[model samples]
Target: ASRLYTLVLVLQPQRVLLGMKKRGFGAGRWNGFGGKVQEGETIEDGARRELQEESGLTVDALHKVGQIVFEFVGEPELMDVHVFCTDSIQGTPVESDEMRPCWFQLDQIPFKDMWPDDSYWFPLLLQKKKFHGYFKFQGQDTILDYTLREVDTV
Candidate 1:
């Protein structure tokens, strides 16, 4: 089985916005804002909606920066995620029932508190490079195997 999702990151010259998931699949972790894409919405639309719903920010524009396939050991569902990045945004960040928003300086990202695969591919976004990645997870916090590489388009 496969599911489609999006992950959006608000990037700045010196910092990036992230959120702590308050519940659901990635609960207890700090990450970019996003969730499953709903029916009839484009991937970018779903990304923007998830970002707004989770952080209360309206995206002015979104750029596709990466793609990743996530497979969990023993699970039938495969997560096909399109990753997006944008500096164009409006509104103040607000905590929603689903997330608590925060800004981290370039060197201050809370990697230890995020998904194992995040640390592998997030740097590509910081460098403004597109990428494609595949990760196999043993559990929520343990990665069993993976591959990440920069790409021309995603």
Candidate 2:
């Protein structure tokens, strides 16, 4: 299987925006706003769409921060996720059908409820660096192995 995904994180007031997934796939986890990049939409536009639908927020501009490939055990599809964020945004964030939007203090991010790979690459984002990553997981929650590195460009 082949799939492309988009992840958008909002960084305003220095706090991070995360969504608590309500159903399907990563349900039960706290994550950034994201989902499939639908056909006929550019990847960047997909990020904006997910952000809008999931959080009811809009960004002035999204900076591409990372690109990651995620693979889970017993799963055939590899998820190609483009990660982006913006310190500038418009509109208020509200919950949606897919996710419950929430804000976390920069020092108090709820990493325990988030994807395991996030802990590895998230720091790079705060450092203002682009990254490339590959994560192999044993199940939905247990990561078997992974690689991450800072890049000049995503």
Candidate 3:
């Protein structure tokens, strides 16, 4: 089975917001705010909820930025992750039980401490480009095979 997920990036002209996941699936790593899409809710709705739950900020609108399919070698399910971006949001980012919010300069993004796939698409996001990708992972940190590309529209 394939499960749907959403990830949101809060952007500023010179900075981007990321969260250090303190627990759950990607613990100890910096990542965008998001998670599984709940039944009966739209993906955008889920993205908004996840962002607020993890960072204490509410996104006013989200621009669809990218889509990625993640497959793990031994996992029975695949993850279809939709990525969203927005500079329009409200409230201050505060630490939540699941994540610690942090902002980084565009040139100083902590790629090494984030998901490997992040490095592949993050730059495109910063450039206001749309994209689509697929990543086959050997495990949590090793990407065995993948494909990525910029697109005219997501």
Candidate 4:
């Protein structure tokens, strides 16, 4: 019925990191910061709460960049993912039971350990460009039935 945003943070790579617990769904993956839109909560609030809840970082500000609407042919609900970019934040990144946060260098990103489609759009967002990407997956492989579009600056 609504949308949610997740943030992929950038930090200098260290050794392999792991989380304390598996909080259902897919966990223990190299990913970004995000969660669901709570009742009476703005998308921004949800984003901020997710970022803070998953990692210890406080988002001073973020720019809404793009969104992806994922529709599984037989699923009842549409997963609309809002995307954002933020360097304006404060907090020493820490790993928790819910999120085992880690950072890898841009060139050294662990694509093999992440969702297959990450490589397609993560770079574009890091460059501060607005873009949208849709993906269809069968297990770990992308089915390529989706699309991506780059928005103009103006």
Candidate 5:
């Protein structure tokens, strides 16, 4: 069993703008905005909740991108994260105690301060490709294990 959450955000790909979590766990790392799903809350609901909590932004168009499961240091195993990409949203990104929102180019991600596996799969999502990533982490190191999905192609 793992904690599940939703991350729905609008991204300015060309400008390298996105809802990045800059506090709490990742502190200043650039990751999508989202958090754990509260008891009795739907995934979508949780997504909206976290987005507002972390970014002070609002939206209604959340498209399912993929799910990523990874282990945290000293945790029971790992948590399951539900990620969503949104094309509709309102408000602006701001800095918070849990996160300091920032943007970076698709090719210029700060891998040094981010999860090692992020650089590997984020591109796929940005490209509109859907898939699931199963990650294995030892301690705080991201040891990517495998991915599961049948990529849609013509």
Candidate 6:
């Protein structure tokens, strides 16, 4: 089975907003602001709410860039992640108990401090190209298999 999740990134002039997760799933690494989609709201609305809760930032709109499903060995469940980005944003980014927000320059993206699957799909997002990807991992750092391709609609 799979569950829906949302991830939102704020793109600036060669910069991107990332949050250092404080605890729980995928903690201790820099990542985009997001969480599991809550019931009774649209996907975009869920993305917006999570971003706001984690970073105190808001955006007028989000552009869907990609989707990825993450799977782990011995775990039948999958993480169906919807990715979104916005070139412009409003409000100042502030940290919360679950996240410490910060802006990172394009040249200094700390991929080493993020999920193992991010490196494969991040470039597609940077180019504003739509893509879908699947990654299977033995654990957090050991990727067992993966595939990604550009998409016309996503």
lDDT (10s digit) by residue, model 1, range 41-144: 99999999999999999999899999999999999999999999999999999987888999999999999998978888888899999999999999888888
Q: State each model's CA lDDT, in order.
A: 0.93, 0.89, 0.94, 0.64, 0.70, 0.89
Per-residue lDDT tens digits for candidate 2, residues 1-154, read 7599999889766688889999998999999889999989999999999898889987779999999999887889999999998988888888878779888899998889898888998888877889999999888888888889898979
lDDT of 3 by residue, 1-154 (tens): 8899999999999899999998889999999999999999999999999998989998898999999999999899999999999899999999867789999999899999999999999999998999999999988999999999999888
| RMSD, every candidate, angstroms | 0.8, 1.1, 0.8, 3.6, 3.0, 0.9
Model 6 residue 114 CA deviation (Å) reads 0.8
> Candidate 4 on 14-59: residue-level lDDT in tens?
3322222347655545666766778888877787787777778777
Worst 10 residues of 5 by lDDT: 15-24
Span of ten consecutive residues with least summed lDDT in model 1: 115-124
Give the deviation of candidate 3 from the true structure as CA RMSD: 0.8
- TM-scores for all predictions: 0.98, 0.95, 0.98, 0.81, 0.83, 0.96
TM-score of 5: 0.83
For TM-score, candidate 2 versus 6, the one ahead is 6
Displacement of residue 115 (Cα, Å) in model 1 is 0.6
Q: Say which candidate scores most in lDDT.
A: 3
| Counted clashes in each candidate structure | 0, 0, 0, 0, 5, 0
Give candidate 1 misplaced runs (Cα > 4 Å).
none
